[PDB]
Amino acid sequence: MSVVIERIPKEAIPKSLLLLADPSERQIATYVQRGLTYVAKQGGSVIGVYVLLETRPKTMEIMNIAVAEHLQGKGIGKKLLRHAVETAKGYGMSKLEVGTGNSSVSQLALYQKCGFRIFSIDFDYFSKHYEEEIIENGIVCRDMIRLAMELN
Template sequence: MDLLLLADPSQKMIERYLDRSTCLAMVKENEIVGVCVLIETRPLTMEIVNIAVREKEQGKGNGKKLIEHATDYAKTKGFRRLEVCTGNSSILQLGFYQKCGFSMTGIDKGYFIDHYAEPIFENGIQCRDRIRFAKRLS
């Protein structure tokens, strides 16, 4: 759970999707250093609902490897679209997902205000809106 909380500060929100998800783990030297949690959202569509890499393993390409593994996993299961969302204040993630081949598809205004009890701040910015990304898996 501590690793999942790096990407989503609400244990309550994590518990809502965990029981219906597939969790891919990255293991190094018998330690889980990264996770990617996927759920089927619609026919032929999977969403990455949580992706996190331990701080000591960040900046080493592990997040990209998790995205590549999630992409391969979704393809082998017959999915044609992979989606991921992040907050408007998640500056690094906004660039990261685009570098991994995702395109912005929409903005859910007020999502984090409506769905999280406590305000979230990153990079000196309040996280208010959910930014949606997707890529085709054909």
């Protein structure tokens, strides 16, 4: 029942779960080396993850956030997100960012419910970063929608 979230070293990342949110192992490598990875545990296993990266001044971005497929829509995304926000304040950041695909409409609702505001679109992001096309609920995942939150 109880989800426990903790830091892990980069040598122990769940590539497995990170690949759910980000199909390329080379992409994942780009930000795990430089960033901070936290995992969610429950039922005797790692079932959630997020990676924070420090980007522009006083800014972190959630580079990857993932929940085990069979456990999605149970409030675990909510929980990881709350934790990312708190971790980011802790580090003295004033801005938290997260990107998601145009097709990721359920994530778009989640992020906004949690305080993120949509501010920008990176066009053709996915076509450019991945050899293979991504389709999600009938919609081509083509562009990265950019969202941000002021922490203070």
